[PDB]
Amino acid sequence: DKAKRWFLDNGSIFLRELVADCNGKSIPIRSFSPEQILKATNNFDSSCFVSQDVYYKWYRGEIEDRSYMIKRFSEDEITGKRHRVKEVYNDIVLSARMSNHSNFLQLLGCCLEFPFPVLVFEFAEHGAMNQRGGVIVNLLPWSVRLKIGKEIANAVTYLHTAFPKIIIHRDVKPMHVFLDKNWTAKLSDLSFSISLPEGKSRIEAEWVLGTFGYIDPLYHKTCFVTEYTDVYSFGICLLVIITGKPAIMTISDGDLQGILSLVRELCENGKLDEVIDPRLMKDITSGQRLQVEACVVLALRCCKERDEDRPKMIQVAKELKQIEASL
C-alpha cells in the first residue's frame, strides 16, 4: 500500500525539522502500527473522542495495557496549504523537544504511516479542559484552579525563555491545558508557534493568527508578534479559569462581551465579589478570596493596552506562584 511512501515522506521532513530544531538530539520517540493505533482510537469515531480544533482532533486511545491521548491531524484542512504543512512539523517536533519539562503534555511517540503524523502522547487521566473545566461528564475545585494557573505560567515561560532562540505560540487558550490524575496542567499542542531568531524579541508576523478573543490587541492592531504577545492571551486565560465564562460570551443579546470588557469596569463598580464563578460559591473560600482578588488584578494588569506596563511571563509566574502563601 501507499502507507510506506507516506512513511518515507513524513519521516524525511520530520527528521529534517527535528534536526533543524534541536540538532537531532531528540527524546525517546517510538513508532506504532495502524493495527495498534486504529484499535486505540476505535477508527476515529467514538466517545473516546475528546475535542476538536482547526487542524487536529484530540482523542483517547488504548494500546495494550495502557490508554493514551492521541492527536490526529485533519488532512483535508492542511494538504493544500504549504504554511500549514511547514507549521505542523514545527508543532510536533517543538512539542517533542519541549517534552523535557514535567509540565508539558509529554510525548510518547508519533505514528507515521498516515498521510499526516497522528501522534500519541501520554495519558492524562481527565479529559481536555474545555472553556470551563473538566469535560468528562460530571466541576473541579479551587486549589487545582490556581495550580493549573502556575502550571500554565511556568510552562509558557519555558516557551519564552528556555532556549537560544525564543519561540512564541500566540494562543494560550484554556482549551489546550490538559489534566491528569495528579491534577497537574500538562499543557499541550505547541501548535500555533513562531520561532523568532536570536537577540531581538520582536518580529513581524507574516500572517496574523489565532483564536479570536485571545488575540492580544497589539498583535491584532500592529501585525507583529512579540515577547509580550502571550501576556494578554494568558491573562484572560487566567480569567476563563476564574469566572468560568467563555471569551465569546453572550448575555441574551448577540455576544457583545469579552471578560476583559466586564472586569475592568466591574472592578470599580462591583468591588470584585462577582467574578469568582458563582457555582464555586459553595466552596467556603475563607481567606483565599484575597488571592482571588490579587490574581484578577494581576490578570487585568497583564491584559492592559500599554504593553510596556505589562509584566513578562517570568514575573507573572513568580507572582502567581507567590500568591500561594495562603497555605
Binding site: 482547526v54 501585525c223 465569546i248
Partner: protein
Amino acid sequence: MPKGSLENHLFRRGAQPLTWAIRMKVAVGAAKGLTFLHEAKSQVIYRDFKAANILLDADFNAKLSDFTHVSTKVIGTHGYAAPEYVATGRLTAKSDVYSFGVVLLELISGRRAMDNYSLVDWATPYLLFRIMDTKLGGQYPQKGAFTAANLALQCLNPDAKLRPKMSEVLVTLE
C-alpha cells in the same frame, strides 16, 4: 480601476500633495455612498471598511465598491478594527463606524497606525492642541475641522452604547 485608493494618493510614499478642504468632501461622499449601501437595506454590515477599499474617481469620488470561525484573522489587519472586534467576533455597525472614524482621523491628519503608539494612542491625548497636522498650511484655519476632530473623538469612543451612526455622521460634517 479609475485612480487607486486613498493611500494610493495620500500615502503614495510621502508624495502627491493632496488638496484643500475636499478630503472632508471625499469622506462625506464615502459616507453618503455607504449609508444607502448598508443601512437603507434591512441590515448590512460592510465587513471590510479600510482605506484599501475607498477608491477615487476623476472628481475624487469615494464610491465604495467590491467589499464561520476563521483562525488567521484578516478583517481589520491594522487599527481599522474596533476594540470589540477584539473580543466578540460579530460584525456590528460599531465596527464600520469605528473604521470610518479612523479613516477620518487619517484624512484630517495623514498618519497611519504603524509602529517603528497607534492613532488612538496619540489622538485622544494630543487635544487646544489642534496643531496635529503639519504637511498642509491651510489645514489649521478651516476650523470646521475642530468640529470634525471632536466628531472623530466621539466616534473613536470604545463602548458601543454611545455610538455615532453612519447616517448622523453627515450632519456634524456638513
